[PDB]
Each structure stands twice: as C-alpha cells, then as structure tokens.
Amino acid sequence: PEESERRALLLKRWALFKQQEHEMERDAIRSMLEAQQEALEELKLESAELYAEAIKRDTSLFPFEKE
Amino acid sequence: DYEYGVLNIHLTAYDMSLAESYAQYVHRLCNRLSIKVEESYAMPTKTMLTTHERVVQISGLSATFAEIFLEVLQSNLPEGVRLSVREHTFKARPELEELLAKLN
Amino acid sequence: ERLEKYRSFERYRRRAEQEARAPHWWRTYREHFRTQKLLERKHFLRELRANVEEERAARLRTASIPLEAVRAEWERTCGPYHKQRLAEYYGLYRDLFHGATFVPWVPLHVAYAVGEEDLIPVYHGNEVTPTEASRAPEVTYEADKDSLWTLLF
Amino acid sequence: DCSRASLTRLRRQAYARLYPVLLVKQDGSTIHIRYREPRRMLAMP
Amino acid sequence: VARKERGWATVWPNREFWHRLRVVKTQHHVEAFVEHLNGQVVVSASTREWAIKKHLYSTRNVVACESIGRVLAQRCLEAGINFMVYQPTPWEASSDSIKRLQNAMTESGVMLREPRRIY
Amino acid sequence: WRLSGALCLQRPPLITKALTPLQEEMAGLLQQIEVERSLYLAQDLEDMWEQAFLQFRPGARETEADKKNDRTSLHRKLDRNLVLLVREKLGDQDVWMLPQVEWQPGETLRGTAERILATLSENNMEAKFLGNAPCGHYKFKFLGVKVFFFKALLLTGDFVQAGKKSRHVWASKEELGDYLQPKYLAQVRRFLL
RNA sequence: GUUAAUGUAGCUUAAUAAAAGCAAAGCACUGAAAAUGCUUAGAUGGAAUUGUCCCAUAAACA
C-alpha cells in the first residue's frame, strides 16, 4: 500500500546508490589496472630485460588464505 | 611464463545466506573480470551447532591479475566471512559422437 | 572462443536484421525483390523530472499523454518529413511530377461539411465516401496576408 | 570495503523467523548473525 | 487480392503480411514502425521525437509503451492502415508493456491481424 | 648510478566501517521480507545477557579513538589499509620516504623486498609477496637516482619497539600527500588502494 | 616557454538532416550464471573537414 510506496522510494535511493558505487568501484579498478600497467611500463623503460624474469608467475605463491 | 592452475575458494561463514551472497557477489566480479567459475558447490553442515561453507571454483589466473584480484577479495570480504584459496585436487550424446571420430 | 556469445535471442535477431539490409557480394533476397533550442529542451526535461507528481503517476502506471497537443507539435516540428513518406509511399511524387520530390511545408487542413458541425478531416490516406464529398470542402492553411497562393484538387 | 556484501536479504526459499545477534569473538571483533531463538549476543569461548 | 509472400517455413517470423509492426526496445528508447513488404516504412512513432518527449515522463517505461502505441494508432488511422500484422516473441508477447501497447491499438481500432487473401 | 630499492607495505583493515543510514533502511527492508517469508521468560535472561555484552568492553572497530596519535603503532587504523612510511635522510636529501634498502642486480626484487620488511622495522612482522612485478619506479636528481617501489601485504604484525627513535608512520592515504609532496613520492597513490 | 600529452557518458570515426547505439546498475526469479520482466544513471569544458589549430588541463625539457 502506501507503506510499500515508501519502501519503493527508498529502493530508488538504494538502487541508484548501488549503481553509483558500482561505477565508482569500476573506475577504481581501472585506475588500479592502469597503475599496475603503468608500473609495468615504468621499469620496462629502465630495463625490459629484467621483466622477462619478473613477468613469470610464482608457482609457490599459493595457497594463500587471509580473512 | 606459465598459466595459473584453477584454485577453489571455500567461503566458510556462520550463515549460508551471507556466504551465498558473497559467493554470488564475488562471482559477479569474476565474470566482469573475465574469470571463469565452473562450479558453485558447497560443503555440508559442520555438526558438532552447525556452520555453512560455499565452494567457489575459480579457474584461470595471471601473475599481475592474481595480485590485484586477491587483494580486492580482502576488501570485498563481508562481515565475519573466512576466506580460503587452494589449488584444485557423464558425457552426453554430442560429446561422445564427436569423440568417436577423433580416435576412429 | 575469443569472441563472447550473444547469450540472448534478441541480440542475435537485431544483428541479423541489420546485416540483411547491408549490401553483399553474394546474391540476396532484396536484390531480386539551434543550440539554444537544445538548452531550452533540456530545461523543460529537468522541470518535468523535478515534478514529483509526474514521477508518482509514472510509478503508478496511471499517467497518460495528450494526443491533441502532440499532434499539433508533430505537424509543426517533424510532421512534414513523415508527410513526405506517405506521399512517396502512395507514389504521388512519382505520378504527378515524374519522380520529382517536393517536401510539404504548410500544414494544410481540409474538411468536408456534413449537415452541421461534423467535419470529416481529410488527412493523408484517409477514407472518405463520395456522398460526403458532394460539396466542396473548407480549406484553411494560414497563408498570412500578402501571401499569394493557388489550390488544386 | 566489507560493507559491499555485508547487507544481503535472505534468498532461501523457505525458512523460519531469524533475529539478529552478535557473536562476540575472543579478539574483540563482533559479527551480526541470524538466529532462530530471540537471543541477544553470543560469545566465542 | 494482392499477393503475400507465403514461404519462409523454416525461418521466423513468417512474411505473409501486407504490413508489419516492429517494436524495438533500445536501452533508453522505444520505437514503433509500420513497414510494407518492400521495406519502406509508412508510419513511424519513436520516443526520440521531440513532441512526444515533452509530454512523456521517461522514454523507457510501460506507460511510454502504452502512450507510444496510442500515438502510432492515430497516425496509422490517419494513413488508412486498418489491418496490420504483429509478430511478437514468446517473452515479448508475455511482456506487460507489449500487452498494454496492443490494448491501445485495439481501442483505436487498428486490427493486429490481417484478413486472409482472396483467391 | 645510484641503485635504491623500496617497499610499499600493505596492512589489511581488521574491522569495517559502520554502515550508512541509507544502508540501515535497506537493512530494515530485507528484514521485513524475511518476516513475510518466515514460519512461526527466556527474553528476560537474554536481556540480562545483552547488558552483560554492553558492560563488557568489546574490541573497538577503530583502535585509534583511544590512541589518536599512534602513527608509530602498527594499529594506527582499522577501517582502512595502512602503509609503512619511515622518515629517511639521504646524502643530498632529507625527505619523508617510503621504506628503502640497497638492492643489487643479483638479488631479485623479492629478495630485497624481503629484506626491506625486517631491515627497517626490526620486528616479527608477517608479510607476503604475491608477484615479482614491481609497482613503482621514481627518479629524483640533484647525480642520477632511482627508487623501486614494491608492494606487499601484512599477514600479521607483532611490532616490537613501538616507540622507535625513527619516525615510521603507518598511513592509508591521508598522510601520503601530507608528508610526500613531490610527484615522485606523492604518486604512490596510483598503485595504492 | 620547448617536447609531450587530453578535450561527446565505460565504448563508438553516433550525429550535425536529430545529442544516438552498445556496455553498465538494481529489483523479481532461486541451483550458480545467463536469459526474461519491472526499473536506474549519466556527456559535446572545445573549434574547425574528412571516412590542425584552440584555450583549458597535466607531465619530461622546464
């Protein structure tokens, strides 16, 4: 009824808020990815040869658990 | 240069509801990040009261991608959820029919 | 595998329809067979958006639109372009002027009087019986003064 | 932030009524949980 | 008495129509067209049009679908197009908005089903 | 050329921030539907227990409200991540710097990175390295110099010698710009969360 | 100031005859996902003409 209408109104605030959060988080990942890619580029200018070993994955890194 | 193995996650939490959401939630991140999730199996109840745990089969990963993703999981981790990351351990008619030709 | 998958019939359907229209090497079925105005418009949109009652009606799926006002607006703004098509569709241009096309501009109005104040509007493609059109209709097109014109049926 | 997935509605098709309670941990942290009985707080031993 | 294409048995939808109604829901807009077999659109009603927008709260809405149908009907009535063919998909047909749109067309008197040809 | 390595340590936030008021109202709504879909004096005893919870002090969500100035302490913040940040004095510079140590080409980035963890903190801290790929490289000249910025996560930390004579500061983002003005040191935020 | 960037909304060499399409969000739905239904958000900070100036901004030189 009218109470449901009010519940719908707060959903509009909440749904819009979540969408804003999603966009904010997506941009945060993009900056993080750009920085990580930018971090890759920076030492490549200094020495690309070093990366050839560095870019190789660490097999022993995992398992890694953190709460 | 090597490709990461498939590492499963056991989302152990007091309430399955919250555990499922985080599982579903992280899966959405996985799909966005282009991470394939083969299965969403879950463990039984931890009878002694009980708890709840949700398996999350994460497949495919890279060294640079690994560092960012796992750290993101820490932030995403909702209230009182215990994370875990571990390396992983009936064919239908079209699949069998294709298989016959390959070895025939 | 690199490319994603449609995962939806509609997305595939729309993509397929566009491709058919595009020309192809192989035979196909088709072969054989100003700024101030924009700012003003945005301001009105914000005012409409601000109105809570408009939102209330929309969320209650009770709102409606006045056809009368839209019809007048349609004639003034973009109606002639549609009017050109319905002339092209019926072949008016290809018949009267051997394929020459003239865009109509004046929103001309015609109606046949039937006994009393019951006017039959003569729009584009309308159906009017010969009985009703026994007598000449009323023509109004707001020529404005000092505006010479000529009319033809 | 943990708040991203902290608030989630129950999706179980059928369940009994659950009230919120805090499970106080031995390190001082607290977590909101849903319990059938109208308890108020839980303590980790 | 004119011919209608009767083939395309293995393809969807059938093309045995003198006119067709295509309703496309874009991300923010809903459009309606009436097109002949030869591919020339006759009557077009779109929410992008200025006149509809000023009186229309949100381009993509159930009311917008219902309202655009009413506008399309009057234009179709204007052109003398009384009989038309609509070919919805199962989910599209079940959609409440499309059902509401067809309700408006039925009220206006536009027939969503054409009569069979005369041989 | 001056070879210098450095490490951008990360400390996870233990306890999350409080939920926003709009989050609260949504929390109420999900409970309301829960009641709808629900099926079917101990209260006094539970009330006696809840006040026992209130009287008994629980671990604060942020352990900086009591401290308010313990930048040196490992538990400077709980709501957000922390970064080790130690004042350093160079031959031609005296600047607030990320932890630095001397690296050699023979030693891999992780090997120097491991040494950075305990060399400047001299504690039983637990931290983990994920990828050999570094996260930042910045060159400042007066003589050419370059500093390599790595990234690490603190599994756990038993920070002995809390009151060091050094100015080690655990900062999330507020003290990054405040203490590190130049882009070569103020751009650490790019690869920081 | 020299080099260099960056300037319709995540993307588009959509658009100057009418600021578009796609991506994206939430809700309903329960294996998960996807789909489907109901819904949500946004821009030309800017001029050229095809199918460079321009100021602003922000960098190495400075």
From Swiss-Prot, chain B:
Coiled coil regions in record: none
Compartment(s) of residence: Mitochondrion
N6-succinyllysine found at: 91
Record text on subunit structure and interactions: Component of the mitochondrial ribosome large subunit (39S) which comprises a 16S rRNA and about 50 distinct proteins. Interacts with OXA1L.
Family named by the database record: Belongs to the mitochondrion-specific ribosomal protein mL48 family.
Protein name: Large ribosomal subunit protein mL48
Organism in which the protein naturally occurs: Mus musculus
Gene behind the chain: Mrpl48
Residues of the full protein shown: 84 to 211 of 211
UniProtKB/Swiss-Prot annotation, chain C:
Coiled coil spans: 35-58
Cell compartment(s), UniProt: Mitochondrion
Signal sequence bounds: none
Domain of life where this protein originates: Eukaryota
Disulfide bonds: none
Subunit structure as annotated in this protein's UniProt entry: Component of the mitochondrial ribosome large subunit (39S) which comprises a 16S rRNA and about 50 distinct proteins.
Recorded family membership: Belongs to the phosphatidylethanolamine-binding protein family. Mitochondrion-specific ribosomal protein mL38 subfamily.
Protein name as it appears in the record: Large ribosomal subunit protein mL38
Originating organism: Mus musculus (Mouse)
Section covered of the full-length record: 46 to 218 of 380
Curated annotation (Swiss-Prot), chain D:
Keyword line: Mitochondrion, Phosphoprotein, Ribonucleoprotein, Ribosomal protein, Transit peptide
Record keyword Plastid present: no
GO MF: structural constituent of ribosome
One GO CC term, this protein: mitochondrion
Major site of localization recorded for this protein: mitochondrion
Family classification: Belongs to the mitochondrion-specific ribosomal protein mL55 family.
Name of the protein: Large ribosomal subunit protein mL55
Species for this entry: Mus musculus (Mouse)
Lineage, uppermost ranks: Eukaryota, Metazoa, Chordata, Craniata, Vertebrata
Gene name of the encoded protein: Mrpl55
UniProtKB/Swiss-Prot annotation, chain E:
Transmembrane segments: none
MF annotations from Gene Ontology: 5S rRNA binding; structural constituent of ribosome
Alphabetic keyword roster: Chaperone, Mitochondrion, Ribonucleoprotein, Ribosomal protein, RNA-binding, Transit peptide, Transport
Entry GO terms, CC: mitochondrial inner membrane; mitochondrial large ribosomal subunit; mitochondrion
Record localization: Mitochondrion
GO biological process, one term: mitochondrial translation
Family according to the record: Belongs to the universal ribosomal protein uL18 family.
Quaternary assembly: Component of the mitochondrial ribosome large subunit (39S) which comprises a 16S rRNA and about 50 distinct proteins.
Main function: Together with thiosulfate sulfurtransferase (TST), acts as a mitochondrial import factor for the cytosolic 5S rRNA. The precursor form shows RNA chaperone activity; is able to fold the 5S rRNA into an import-competent conformation that is recognized by rhodanese (TST). Both the cytoplasmic and mitochondrial forms are able to bind to the helix IV-loop D in the gamma domain of the 5S rRNA.
The name this protein goes by in its record: Large ribosomal subunit protein uL18m
